[PDB]
Amino acid sequence: TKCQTPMGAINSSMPFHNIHPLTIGECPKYVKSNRLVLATGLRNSP
Amino acid sequence: DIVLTQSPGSLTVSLGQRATISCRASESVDNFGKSFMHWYQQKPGQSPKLLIYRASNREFGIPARFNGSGSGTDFALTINPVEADDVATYFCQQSNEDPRTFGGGTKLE
Amino acid sequence: GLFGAIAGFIEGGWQGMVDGWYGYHHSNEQGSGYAADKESTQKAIDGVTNKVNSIIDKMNTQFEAVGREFNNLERRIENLNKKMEDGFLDVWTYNAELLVLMENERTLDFHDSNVKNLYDKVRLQLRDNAKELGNGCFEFYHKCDNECMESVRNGTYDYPQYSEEARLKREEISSGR
Amino acid sequence: GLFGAIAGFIEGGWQGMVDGWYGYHHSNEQGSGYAADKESTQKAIDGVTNKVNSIIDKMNTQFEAVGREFNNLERRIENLNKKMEDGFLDVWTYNAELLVLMENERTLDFHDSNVKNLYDKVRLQLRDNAKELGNGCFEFYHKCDNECMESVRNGTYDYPQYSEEARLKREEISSGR
């Protein structure tokens, strides 16, 4: 990998991860959140 | 397949001089910023021996006379000064991409 | 929502308009159909795309924990190390989560704005050559064939060309038919 | 403010409408009166309530100072401890103060929006069956009794049913007598 965690490696393009804060390598940035989703499209009807 | 071609095939060098063996890769063997080339020494009549890993660093217990050099498509094992117990055939092998491929090998006299 | 167009005076969207975020439904003698304003939709895509990159980019530098070990009589600095590192994780998590929540509102209202503005673009083109029906639709006072529809969709609508026909219908409308 | 309704084209509010944030004043032969719009008022309440809760909730994890003591030759880590703990108090305070300032603006404009949108709801129902007076009020071209008033307030206004009576008045009105 480009990124290793004490629980395992990450292979990801995402800007964030929530695996473990102590990483080495070229990693995403750790946050405590369970869920992070940006809106891109618009509000869905039904 | 990454075809590895060593040159020259056979090299005779005077004692106490410089042996310079080359390697040329069909495609690069060189990502993550490091070169994934390796040099191996086969003294006659026995199994091959590990000299250099990732193209530049000596394996423990290898004399400094061995200069691993190169980057990308072409590399070079430099033995200097050449000693008596250096008669062997030298191999370069890449690990950048299966299937693991070796050089033809270069015999030193 | 804020601009009152999406899930407002236009109630619900069109499953059958697949080639864009905003667009038109037309209905005349030659049939009916969906279309899209590519250009407005594109500005939205450009906008939202820049927004997502801008979020990613500003969060690029950000605290990165490191392991340090401490012995049984360095408990105070060990705690200070923990709390310090936790402290930043909490801060960045707050920054990140709140950024997401806040920009979502902006993004959704952005779209709502985009649909209103498009409607208003059309509204001020047609004027009294069409009748505002109130649900997002216009009912023309004149005949508008497929060429004419395209002219409306592209800002090309010629008001003078139909104004005579429009005023003639209103005249029949005043008479009661 | 942003939407130009609260303290804009509607100048000042109604001290006399107590059972909601937004609503109607009507006036006809049968009397006059105030009436809240329940659904818009409720959406506002849902929104502001969720908003205030979200603020409380996001500030739930957040730096918590702890006391640690240090002796007279641990001044550097004692200082490092102070500046660290102060550093976070300053950050959270900024985050908290700035969140409040930004969300107040959003809240006030939210209301402004809600009102414009309520106004536009009536506007696109009535159309030319009423005259836009410019002050937040509509004057009907036809008689609108207590039953009819309720129909406007709740989405049920039938335009076709009155459209005939309306067009008849405008005719008298247009000639000047």
Add this chain to the structure above:
Amino acid sequence: GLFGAIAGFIEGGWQGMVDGWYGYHHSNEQGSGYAADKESTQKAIDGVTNKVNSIIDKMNTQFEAVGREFNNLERRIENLNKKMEDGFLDVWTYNAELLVLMENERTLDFHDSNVKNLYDKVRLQLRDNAKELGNGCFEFYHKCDNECMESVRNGTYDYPQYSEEARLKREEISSGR
């Protein structure tokens, strides 16, 4: 942008109006000219000025690095000191940059709002005594001299006073010329 006015239905601004951000161009027999709306321009200036001061002021307390030195066997606290101090520089840098970006959007959308609202102040005054042309301009159905222009710009336009002259003109227009 969001309100569709600046670089929207009013396409491009006036190089020749120097004494304000928003205002009027009028045109009649007696000539033409530009004129700033003092009150909106002042509110905008008041608005942006308070905003900038509020930004400066909230960033007033904020982390201030201090030099501390450490010896060759205090590598762990030297690192913890470094990362901590860097940790705050990053947070504040994020805070400053993101604040600028979010408020620039708000500022630009603020102006867009101000122009829409100014246009709408004129629109709901004139009503059908003038014709909405769709480009930011109104064409009067009656003669409006330099004095009358001023009355519109400052809130004083009397609709009943011209309403008679307007309806007479609309009749000629209906005949077709």
Add this chain to the structure above:
Amino acid sequence: DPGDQICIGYHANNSTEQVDTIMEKNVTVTHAQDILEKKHNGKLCDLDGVKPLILRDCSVAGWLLGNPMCDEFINVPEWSYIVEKANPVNDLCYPGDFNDYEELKHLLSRI
């Protein structure tokens, strides 16, 4: 008789993707973008090229001092990171203490 019509409108689909907002949770949207990675592969790996020095039941002390049970690590090649168990069985076989042990471990974080 009815007249022609043009409507302005917007995209809908069968997405059940959901975003949160300050005023409203679980808003269902036409399109969305996840930005959190929650998945890993559960293994310790080579990092860019380089295998880590995975000590097994040896400790960092155990390794450097060369506890007999740590013979596997007598002469290690370049490594990318070191991995140490919470409580290595093979540490200071002869009881004692390792001075500035943590400060030394800190030095290893750079080697």
